[PDB]
Amino acid sequence: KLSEEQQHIIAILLDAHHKTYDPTYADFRDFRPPVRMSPLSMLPHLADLVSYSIQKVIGFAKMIPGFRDLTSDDQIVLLKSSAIEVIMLRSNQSFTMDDMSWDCGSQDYKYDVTDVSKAGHTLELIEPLIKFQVGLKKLNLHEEEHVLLMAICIVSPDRPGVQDAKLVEAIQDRLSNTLQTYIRCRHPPPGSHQLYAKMIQKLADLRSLNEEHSKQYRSLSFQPENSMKLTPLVLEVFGN
């Protein structure tokens, strides 16, 4: 039932993800170190982490079949609006529900509710972020459906600023069809439709987590003392 094109798309996205996600987390050692107490002691470390993650998201996105065919303007608006969502999404592979934290190789690089607050955020964001990660874990997604979800998140025609919405929608359609077909090859109805519905809802959830992170980011980065601790790529991508 998975056509030749669908297996091909899936193989591409899996290779793109394995080329942009290091499960050894070896590069976390080159970030500014985590300081667990300026009540924003984790801001330098987590800023470097976010900056690193943006670069990984751009590398993944470039390998999405069809993304190259978009204009440069549409590639930029898609990555600017999607980046925080793909970061939250891809971070689930490091999320461990033992202690509701993101385990990234060691005790130093393990981030819990209070580590994120030490970068300036409140439970207004973190509480829905943790439950999002837990709900994602419950779904028990194949890596195949995970990378398809990240790609569908990026190529969305409803992002503000998108020029060629129809092309973007045509690219998303082929990824959507590919994921729907992968589910149907794996799960019979009605369970197949219940899973696809739970994944769509997670994309809706990321939109509202996006809006809430952006409001807190705008408040945090408005203080020059916080802006100073960010990185140039974060200020460019998350700003103007």
Partner: peptide, 11 residues
Amino acid sequence: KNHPMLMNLLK
């Protein structure tokens, strides 16, 4: 353009 570093990472 406003995004030279992102443009660069897109090459």
